[PDB]
Design a protein around this ligand. Structure first.
Ligand code: HEA
Ligand SMILES: CCCCC/C=C/C/C=C/C/C=C\C/C=C\CCCC(=O)O[C@H](COC(=O)CCCCCCCCCCCCCCCCC)COP(=O)(O)OCCN
Ligand SMILES: CCCCCC/C=C\CCCCCCCCCC(=O)O[C@H](COC(=O)CCCCCCCCCCCCCCC)COP(=O)(O)OC[C@@H](O)CO
Ligand SMILES: CCCCCCCCCCO[C@@H]1O[C@H](CO)[C@@H](O[C@H]2O[C@H](CO)[C@@H](O)[C@H](O)[C@H]2O)[C@H](O)[C@H]1O
Ligand SMILES: CCCCCCCCCCO[C@@H]1O[C@H](CO)[C@@H](O[C@H]2O[C@H](CO)[C@@H](O)[C@H](O)[C@H]2O)[C@H](O)[C@H]1O
Ligand SMILES: C[C@H](CCC(=O)O)[C@H]1CC[C@H]2[C@@H]3[C@H](O)C[C@@H]4C[C@H](O)CC[C@]4(C)[C@H]3C[C@H](O)[C@]12C
Ligand code: CUA
Ligand SMILES: [Cu+2]
Ligand SMILES: [Mg+2]
Ligand code: NA
Ligand SMILES: [Zn+2]
Lengths: 84, 58, 46, 514, 73, 144, 43, 49, 98, 79, 105, 259, 227
């Protein structure tokens, strides 16, 4: 592959700055727009107490032992279902 | 900012027999003592914790 | 500088053979005894 | 001055000395554990308790002998002492990081001793397989302390490996190519590469075990879609290279010892020896599932692992025959170190050949998890690694200390050990073939005779170990100072005297390119 | 008096080696005959002889009458 | 003469059969008579006495080949001492049996073994070679 | 190897002492534990 | 001059051998160790049922 | 564009690093970074071995690609010979301020 | 038609030592067939083969656990 | 490779160099005994005459010892070599190790 | 006085304090997991940080201030860093092996399918794609920083390095948000296990890499680096590329292929 | 079962075990031959005062040292792999039996026709009847038809175990969540013993396996009586 750009002559910082502001950061800005468009809360699926999920073989070493470290009440049910 | 590397070079090259970890001056000594005290004290505490945990407390 | 030469490049003294015998006895002896006392410890528990 | 020198060291010799002392102490611990094993088995019935206390002893025996005796002595001890001297380097590349590799070991050992003191210990085998090692069948802190002990030993050796590779590649005289470095230096370099690649995989596997035990992951738990067999793959991906890690520095020392006491300037077939160690190191990464022939693997997989495992015999045979060819025409000096090396060659060969028996998966179905495997590996470890260690120790003791051993005592010690280890392990072949399982605290009555003899053997080795301590004491007690050493022209490590000054090669060697 | 004859003076080690490697080989072939005959062939024959006229039902009846079975009296 | 530790970097004397001519003479310092002998050595060796020839040899070399290559009685000490310590080991095993081991299981009682042996024969344990093969089921005895 | 005579010779008697003390340092503590096994188990 | 081995070698060999054999024989035969040898040619089988 | 502000080694290197850099500019090697090139090694044309003391270890690779290196102390005074190949070496002592 | 059932025959889909998927597949197949048959008012007797095979191969505890989970609504396989 | 005759000739020439020095004498003998052979009488003869030019009686005796040693268990070799060297031994006044009692343990 | 170019290091307490910090962190984790206490762990983390700070401080003193980093010493450090990165690659390899083992042969407990029944994977085209663009962009900006430094350009080196660090922070914040928003957890069977442990160790390495870049930023501010001698920067850049490549493998394997 | 002072394998009860014995014999000869060749050559190297200490050329002899061992390995591998693929061949079983490992006992399920299952525990030493074998007898034996191809399926409901019967050449690990298959065929009636062959905790030494091999008609009646 050769991308589709095309440079080389001298070489160095100026080219990489050109790539930083002309390709890399624009790509980030575009992906940021794409992301902040498909964002903002999806409908949570019905709770089903599947035995291969919400595993508890030992209480967690924090909280009440039953909440995952970055527990999100909206989308993370407990073994007994979504919080009240 | 200004380039003060030459000043630090003079300081750390002073012929005073000090090891590099103490050559910055009195603050090195303090930070060293804090570190070693926490390590050695912590280690004694870990041994106490072992002593406690080696016997049933049911 | 540090001491150089036979008997000086070690963290233990060999200046007196009997004191050395005691230290080596404590050193190797403690290592060999430890598992027996751990077994004793485990047996005395439950 | 004491603390500066011995706790704050940046000196390869002193750090080497620390590792030798640590390894010697660990050897006493490992020896006691092995005697408890053989006391339990020395007559039919129960001596200590059921399989829990028994397998705590067995598990600790292995971890201590491997991680705290063999690796620290060969790599930390002989590696630190000899490698910089053998390449004329002023120290290791990272002399301060080197000291941390050492100091991580007493805490690692403390964590292992904690595991055995809390709850009922970790009676898991040194393999630590789930679900037995999981939080239901081994609830409580013991297994986690074992995992953490392994993490610390792993970090120590990984940083050590980085140090040795860098030192050996970067710090030779400019005229010295890698093909002008002694074979022990090669053996350490290759061992270090094996450590660098294998230990991180173990670290991943035991970390997964840690999270299964404490964070409700299910890597190895079928209830979550996990698989106990995945753990086995990750462990043995490290575990096979590990046994080559244990023996390679031994091969390196054996090459030096055999050359030296044959009065030769060089080992037979140097480039073949380098080739053999590299081939063994490489092949050592593609064979691991020979530890898993009974887990239910596909037939073609079992055919491949059978064949790949056997192939290692080729480069290994080159080394054995090259040692024999080094002896050929030698002015043989029957020193105690030479006796250790000759014992090594024969006993390593025996254990290698029983390995070949085991490589046949069909036969391994019947021999797996029996004493035949125990016999196989004690011939390569207790009569390979240990004999190479004892050989190197008696050979280089005068370099490290500046004092001589009593050669007669050292020959007596060798004789007792040789009888003891063979009486201990040879009968275990019979026990394995006739079906005695591993990790048993008691056996059906038919197995009594061989177990009795094996246990009697272990006591003979105990006597040898006690005598070894006395022999070291006698040397330091009498203080016979070294004067002259033969063959310095081809053994650079001796050329700075005995013991060498704290700082050696402050002015580097002169080697021209021609 | 008489002069001593000139003996062979060169390659004494190599000659010793040559002679004994062949002897090491000849032993191996001599032993190969032994282990094959005393162990391997003996085993083949023992199994062939055992099964040639072996009657499994008769074997079972003897065991049954001896009272060894849970499933058969 | 007297070898010093601090001479380690200097060429040294060695007696070994594969290095017959070492880097230095055994004795470098010469007395008045020994100087005269070294001068005499510059003339015909036929004029040297046997004693003078031996003295010249012993100035140059420490031990002769016959001396340096001599066999010793060391093996007796090694083998004897090894057997003593192996013997001492049996004392430890005697102690263990007396003070550590309790009784073995009742299944090793003579009568149990006799009955167990018959039951093994009744179930034809190893009937091809190993066990029952050695019993004569016709004569009701062990095969000769 | 060559070496100087011992700077501090260890006589046969002294060796007997060093050897005995060394052996006892291994044997006595382990012996004590194994002797008292029944006491530990049945308690 | 005669060394340790010249003076004591014979005695060390003789006594070591004698002691070793004597104590192993005693240990093997006199203290109730059960070796559990083969019953073949040794044990008379007895009715068990 | 334009901006400097980054010091050079010439401006800022110090200690041993600076010594090595300055010596290299003069084609000198006081810290033994380079392999010395051999002479014919005869008694008239011996390999000249610099040293800051009165003895230095020589390693002799007698023939190209020999894996075995022959090691010996070279002392101030009369040229010495490799004990394997006999090539001559002579010590040339004195000073690091060379 | 295949009567005189002895045990589950060799299945080329599952030729190796690990037979877990064989048990699983036949359990799925039986219950999928049974659902298909009860829905269209047909005969469950046509599903019998899969039933015999999974009964032969599957540990009792697996079958029991799977049955419980189907009843609970927590069976993770598609039926 | 070179014949036995050529090997011997090179070694005779080595020791026959008029101004051979002490170092070269030792180097020659210490190298020669590394080979799988007992040196021909003509080689030893040249080495002994080198000893004479170097005023070194002791080394001449030592050379005779190493000939015996290189023969190992072949007891017939040394007496043959001494036989062949007798005219040279007589000419140079070299006593054998045996004549000097140096074969005694 | 030495006449080789290698560094004889002053006797140092940091190896011992580091080793003890390891004991404290591990016994601390044990205390936390089994005896409901964070005390040992917090002490261990503290002494570990203190050890790292003073050790690397001293390396800067030894090099920038004392001149011990000759070309030969630098070359050793190059090898050291490369070998360290290799060991880290093998560490991640273990987790990728676990992931492929579980996903290529999903067990009956999962529904015999991947992703498991009841698992709703993130959309790889949303925040995970954004994260990918972010780390790739930071690889470009760090390369700009490297060239500016070699060309002697202080201001542009600082600007490019700041941009690189900002992107590292952005990734870390995006990942933290994604962790919070994820409808599955570490306890959600082998899917959750592989996802969070693999991406979690990666996230830790991003934090480590970002910290290393921040160290370089402040050293640059203090003029430590010359246009020719700046191994700390090179090492941080190599480590940063390593972190990028691991992400690319995670993205392709776990987020995309495993969705 | 093993007998006192046994040196080798238990007598073969199955054709596959017979094959393993002959293959072991083949391999062990080679093991003996190499070990002795090495011991002999070693003693040869060490028993002469003759010396040759100059540099020795290596390449010619290294050809021998690589080629000969390679040939020997092929001579082992050929029959080894033949047996491997023989064991793997399709054989059509007449019966399927499951065994589940537990701490610390085995359970058995014969569910081809009826729901037959039971637990199998070691007979405690204090309860052995005269003539019974310490640590080996069970309360409920695994009764099986002789001279018939039987499919054994092996799993666990807790930790790892391993189901082994040495005289039949059998050892299959018992892994929870996994169903491992092996085939079994006894040439003879009788009692064939094995022991748990994966470390599984406190009573690992004490959960044995006893197979009772009888004619089909006896097996059928036993099966019916066990319902
Ligand atoms: C130093 C340690 C060491 C070494 C070097 C080896 C070397 C070898 N090992 Fe071993 N092994 C262990 C330590 C070691 N092993 C341990 C600890 C275990 C079990 C771990 C556990 O379960 O806890 C184990 C387990 C193990 C198994 C698993 C058995 C089982 O668990 O069921 C197998 C089978 O493949 C095996 C085979 C081999 C082979 C083929 C070699 C070969 O590399 C040996 C090659 C050497 C020779 C063959 C001798 C020299 C060669 C010649 C003289 C030439 C002539 C020879 C021929 C033509 C064959 N080993
Ligand atoms: C941006 C990511 C950075 C992570 C930040 C969190 C701090 C932990 C430190 C990082 C180390 C990462 C690996 C450890 C594994 C577990 C953490 C995985 C990453 C993570 O943070 O996973 C979280 C769970 O964390 C949990 O359990 C909490 C677990 C915290 C305890 C630490 C675990 C013990 C560490 C063991 C490491 C040993 C390594 C040894 C290396 C030696 C090599 C030789 C996910 O949250 P959740 O609510 O389940 O799901 C989200 C639902 N909305
Ligand atoms: C939540 C976080 C907690 C976890 C703990 C980890 C925390 C993060 C630590 C971040 C790493 C910071 C490293 C800073 C190193 C600064 C010292 C330095 O960079 O030293 C440089 C040498 O490189 C050198 O040693 C390079 C050596 C250092 C490289 C090592 C960096 C990686 C370490 C990461 C630890 C791995 C953890 C693994 C997790 C499983 C100095 O040489 P130069 O730069 O050429 O200067 C000289 C010129 O000035 C002369 O003109
Ligand atoms: C040089 C400096 C280094 C040395 C540092 C030594 C400090 C030691 C003192 C700490 O002791 C505290 O005691 C608490 C109470 O006694 C404990 O809490 C624990 O104790 C209870 C039982 O678990 C619970 O109530 C708590 O939640 C639980 O965290 C816990 O061990 C610890 O915090
Ligand atoms: C596995 C390796 C170890 C195996 C070899 C051990 C060899 C034994 C060494 C001696 O050990 C001692 O034996 C004494 C008995 O001989 C014990 O005294 C015990 O018995 C005496 C006699 O009954 C009493 O007087 C004492 O009070 C009582 O402690 C004593 O405690 C114990 O130290
Ligand atoms: C003050 C300093 C001038 C360089 C010098 O000291 O000689 C300048 C040059 C580059 C600057 C940095 C870079 O431009 C990147 C950052 C840009 C942000 O807008 C402010 C902070 C930021 C981190 C700047 C802080 C400060 O103004 C810097 C560090
Ligand atoms: Cu069940 Cu071991
Ligand atoms: Cu292996
Ligand atoms: Mg197993
Ligand atoms: Na027992
Ligand atoms: Zn040379």
């Amino acid at each position: 592959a050769s991308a589709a750009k095309g440079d080389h002559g001298g070489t160095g910082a100026r080219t990489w700055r050109f790539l930083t502001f002309g390709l890399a950061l624009p790509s980030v800005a575009l992906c940021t727009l794409n992301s902040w468009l498909h964002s903002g809360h999806r409908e949570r699926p019905a709770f089903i107490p599947y035995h291969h999920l919400r595993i508890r073989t030992k209480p967690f070493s924090w909280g009440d032992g039953n909440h995952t470290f970055f527990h999100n009440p909206r989308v993370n049910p407990l073994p007994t279902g979504y919080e009240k | 900012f200004e380039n003060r590397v030459a000043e630090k070079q003079k300081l750390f090259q002073e012929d005073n027999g000090l090891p590099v970890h103490l050559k910055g001056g009195a603050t090195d000594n303090i930070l060293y003592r804090v570190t070693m005290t926490l390590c050695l004290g912590g280690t004694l505490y870990s041994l106490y914790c072992l002593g406690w945990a080696s016997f049933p407390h049911k | 500088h540090y001491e150089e030469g036979p008997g000086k490049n070690i963290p233990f003294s060999v200046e007196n053979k009997w004191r050395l015998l005691a230290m080596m006895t404590l050193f190797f002896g403690s290592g060999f005894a430890a598992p027996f006392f751990i077994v004793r410890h485990q047996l005395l528990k439950k | 001055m004491f603390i500066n020198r011995w706790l704050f060291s940046t000196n390869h010799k002193d750090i080497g000395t620390l590792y030798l002392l640590f390894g010697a102490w660990a050897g006493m611990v490992g020896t006691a554990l092995s005697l408890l094993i053989r006391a339990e088995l020395g007559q039919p019935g129960t001596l200590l308790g059921d399989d829990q206390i028994y397998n705590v002893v067995v598990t600790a025996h292995a971890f201590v002998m491997i991680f705290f005796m063999v690796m620290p002595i060969m790599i930390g001890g002989f590696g630190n002492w000899l490698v910089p001297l053998m390449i004329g380097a002023p120290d290791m590349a990272f002399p301060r990081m080197n000291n941390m590799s050492f100091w991580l070991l007493p805490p690692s050992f403390l964590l292992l001793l904690a595991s055995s003191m809390v709850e009922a210990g970790a009676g898991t085998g040194w393999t630590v397989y789930p679900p037995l090692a999981g939080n239901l069948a081994h609830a409580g802190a013991s297994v986690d302390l074992t995992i953490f002990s392994l993490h610390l030993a792993g970090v120590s050796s990984i940083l050590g490996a980085i140090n040795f590779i860098t030192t050996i590649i970067n710090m030779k005289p400019p005229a010295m190519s890698q093909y002008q470095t002694p074979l022990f230096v090669w053996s350490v370099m290759i061992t270090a590469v094996l450590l660098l690649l294998s230990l991180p995989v173990l670290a991943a596997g035991i970390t997964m075990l840690l999270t299964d035990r404490n964070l409700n992951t299910t890597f190895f738990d079928p209830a979550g879609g996990g698989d106990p067999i995945l753990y086995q793959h990750l462990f043995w991906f490290f575990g096979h290279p590990e046994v080559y890690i244990l023996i390679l520095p031994g091969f390196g020392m054996i090459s030096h010892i055999v050359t030296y006491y044959s009065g030769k300037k060089e080992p037979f077939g140097y480039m073949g020896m380098v080739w053999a160690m590299m081939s063994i190191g490489f092949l050592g990464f593609i064979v691991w599932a020979h530890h898993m022939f009974t887990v239910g693997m596909d037939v073609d997989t079992r055919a491949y692992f059978t064949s790949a495992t056997m192939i290692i015999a080729i480069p290994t045979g080159v080394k054995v025959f090259s040692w024999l060819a080094t002896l050929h025409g030698g002015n043989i000096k029957w020193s105690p170190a030479m006796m250790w090396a000759l014992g090594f060659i024969f006993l390593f060969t025996v254990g290698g050949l029983t390995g070949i028996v085991l490589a046949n998966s069909s036969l391994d179905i019947v021999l797996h998890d029996t004493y035949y495997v125990v016999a196989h590996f004690h011939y390569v470890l207790s009569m390979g690694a240990v004999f190479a260690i004892m050989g190197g120790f008696v050979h280089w003791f005068p370099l490290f200390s500046g004092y001589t051993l009593n050669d007669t005592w050292a020959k007596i010690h060798f004789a007792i050990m040789f009888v003891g280890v063979n009486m201990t392990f040879f009968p275990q072949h019979f026990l394995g073939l006739s079906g005695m399982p591993r990790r048993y605290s008691d056996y059906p009555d038919a197995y009594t005779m061989w177990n009795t003899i094996s246990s009697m053997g272990s006591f003979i080795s105990l006597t040898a170990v006690m005598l070894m301590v006395f022999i070291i004491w006698e040397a330091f007690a009498s203080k016979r100072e070294v004067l002259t050493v033969d063959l310095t022209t081809t053994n650079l490590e001796w050329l700075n005297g005995c013991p060498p000054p704290y700082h050696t090669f402050e002015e580097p060697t002169y080697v021209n390119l021609k | 008096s008489t002069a001593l004859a000139k003996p062979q003076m060169r390659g004494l080690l190599a000659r010793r080696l040559r002679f004994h490697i062949v002897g090491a080989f000849m032993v191996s072939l001599g032993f190969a005959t032994f282990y094959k005959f005393a162990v391997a062939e003996k085993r083949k024959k023992a199994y062939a002889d055992f099964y040639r006229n072996y009657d499994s039902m008769k074997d079972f009846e003897e065991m049954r009458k001896a009272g060894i079975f849970q499933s058969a009296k | 003469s007297v070898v010093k530790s601090e001479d380690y970097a200097l060429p040294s004397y060695v007696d070994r059969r594969d290095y017959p001519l070492p880097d230095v003479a055994h004795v470098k310092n010469l007395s008045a008579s020994q100087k005269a002998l070294k001068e005499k050595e510059k003339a015909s060796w036929s004029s040297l006495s046997i004693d003078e020839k031996v003295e010249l040899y012993r100035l140059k070399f420490k031990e002769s080949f016959a001396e340096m290559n001599r066999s010793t009685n060391e093996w007796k000490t090694v083998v004897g001492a090894a057997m003593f310590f192996i013997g001492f080991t049996a004392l430890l095993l005697i102690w263990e049996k007396h003070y550590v081991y309790g009784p073995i299981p009742h299944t090793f009682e003579e009568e149990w073994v006799a009955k167990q042996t018959k039951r093994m024969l009744d179930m034809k344990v190893a009937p091809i070679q190993g066990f029952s093969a050695k019993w004569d089921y016709d004569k009701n005895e062990w095969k000769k | 190897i060559t070496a100087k005579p011992a700077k501090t010779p260890t006589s046969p008697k002294e060796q007997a002492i060093g050897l005995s003390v060394t052996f006892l340092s291994f044997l006595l503590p382990a012996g004590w534990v194994l002797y008292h096994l029944d006491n530990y188990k049945k308690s | 001059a005669p060394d340790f081995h010249d003076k004591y070698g014979n005695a060390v060999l003789a006594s070591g051998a004698t002691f070793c054999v004597a104590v192993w024989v005693y240990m093997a035969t006199q203290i109730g160790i059960e070796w559990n040898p083969s019953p073949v040619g040794r044990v008379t089988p007895k009715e068990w049922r | 564009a334009s901006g400097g502000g980054v010091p050079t080694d010439e401006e800022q290197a110090t200690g041993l690093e600076r010594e090595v850099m300055l010596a290299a500019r003069k084609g000198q090697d006081p810290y033994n970074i380079l392999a010395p090139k051999a002479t014919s090694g005869t008694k008239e044309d011996p390999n000249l071995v610099p040293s800051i003391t009165n003895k230095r270890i020589v390693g002799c690779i007698c023939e190209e690609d020999n894996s075995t290196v022959i090691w010996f102390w070279l002392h101030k005074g009369e040229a010495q010979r490799c004990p394997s190949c006999g090539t001559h070496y002579k010590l040339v002592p004195h000073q690091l301020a060379h | 038609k295949i009567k005189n059932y002895q045990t589950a025959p060799f299945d080329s889909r599952f030729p190796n030592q690990n037979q877990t998927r064989n048990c699983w597949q036949n359990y799925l197949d039986f219950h999928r067939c049974e659902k298909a048959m009860t829905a269209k008012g047909g005969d469950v007797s046509v599903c019998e083969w899969y039933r015999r095979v999974y009964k032969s191969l599957c540990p009792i505890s697996w079958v029991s656990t799977w049955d419980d989970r189907r009843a609970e609504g927590t069976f993770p396989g598609k039926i | 490779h070179e014949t036995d005759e050529e090997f011997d000739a090179r070694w005779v020439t080595y020791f026959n160099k008029p101004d051979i020095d002490a170092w070269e004498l030792r180097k020659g003998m210490n190298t020669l005994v590394g080979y799988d052979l007992v040196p021909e009488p003509k080689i030893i003869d040249a080495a002994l005459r080198a000893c004479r030019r170097l005023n070194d009686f002791a080394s001449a005796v030592r050379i005779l010892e190493v000939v015996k040693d290189k023969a190992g268990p072949h007891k017939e070799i040394y007496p043959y070599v001494i036989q062949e060297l007798r005219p040279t031994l007589n000419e140079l006044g070299i006593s054998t190790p045996e004549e000097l009692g140096l074969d005694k343990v | 006085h030495q006449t080789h170019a290698y560094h004889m290091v002053n006797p140092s307490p940091w190896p011992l304090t580091g080793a003890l910090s390891a004991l404290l962190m591990t016994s601390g984790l044990t205390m936390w997991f089994h005896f409901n206490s964070m005390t040992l762990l917090m002490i261990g983390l503290t002494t570990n940080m203190l050890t790292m700070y003073q050790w690397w401080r001293d390396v800067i003193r030894e090099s920038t201030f004392q001149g011990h980093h000759t070309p030969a010493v630098q070359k050793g450090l190059r090898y050291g860093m490369i070998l360290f990165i290799i060991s880290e690659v093998l560490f991640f390899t273990g987790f990728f092996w676990a992931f492929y083992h579980s996903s290529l042969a999903p067990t009956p407990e999962l529904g015999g399918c991947w992703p498991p029944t009841g698992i709703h994977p993130l959309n790889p085209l949303e925040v995970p794609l954004l994260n990918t663009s972010v780390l790739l962009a930071s690889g470009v900006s760090i390369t700009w920083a490297h060239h500016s430094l070699m060309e002697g350009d202080r201001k542009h080196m600082l600007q490019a390095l700041f941009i690189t660090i900002t992107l590292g922070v952005y990734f870390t914040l995006l990942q933290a948000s994604e962790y919070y928003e994820a409808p599955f957890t570490i306890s959600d069977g082998v899917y959750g296990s592989t996802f969070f442990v693999a991406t979690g160790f990666h996230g830790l390495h991003v934090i480590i890499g970002s910290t290393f870049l921040i160290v370089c930023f402040f050293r640059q501010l203090k003029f430590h680096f010359t246009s020719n001698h700046h191994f700390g920067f090179e090492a941080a850049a190599w480590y940063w590329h390593f972190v990028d490549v691991v992400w690319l493998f995670l993205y392709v394997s776990i987020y995309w292929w495993g969705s | 079962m093993a007998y006192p002072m046994q040196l080798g394998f238990q007598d073969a009860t199955s054709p596959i075990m017979e094959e393993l014995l002959h293959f072991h014999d083949h391999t062990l000869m080679i093991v003996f031959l190499i070990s002795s060749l090495v011991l002999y050559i070693i003693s040869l190297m060490l028993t002469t005062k003759l010396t040759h200490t100059s540099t020795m050329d290596a390449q010619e002899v290294e050809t021998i040292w690589t080629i000969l061992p390679a040939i020997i390995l092929i001579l082992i591998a050929l029959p080894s792999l033949r047996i491997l693929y023989m064991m793997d061949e399709i054989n059509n079983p007449s019966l399927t039996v499951k065994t589940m490992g537990h701490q610390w006992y085995w359970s058995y399920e014969y569910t081809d026709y009826e729901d037959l299952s039971f637990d199998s525990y070691m007979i405690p030493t204090s309860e052995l009847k005269p003539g019974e074998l310490r640590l080996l007898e069970v309360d409920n034996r695994v009764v099986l038809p002789m001279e018939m191809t039987i499919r054994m399926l092996v799993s666990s409901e807790d930790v790892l175990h391993s189901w082994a019967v040495p005289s039949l050449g059998l050892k299959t690990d018992a892994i929870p969540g996994r169903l491992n298959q092996t085939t079994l065929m006894s040439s003879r009636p009788g009692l064939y013993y094995g022991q748990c062959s994966e470390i599984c905790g406190s009573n690992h030494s004490f959960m044995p396996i006893v197979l009772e091999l009888v004619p089909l008609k006896y097996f059928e009646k036993w099966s019916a009586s066990m319902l």
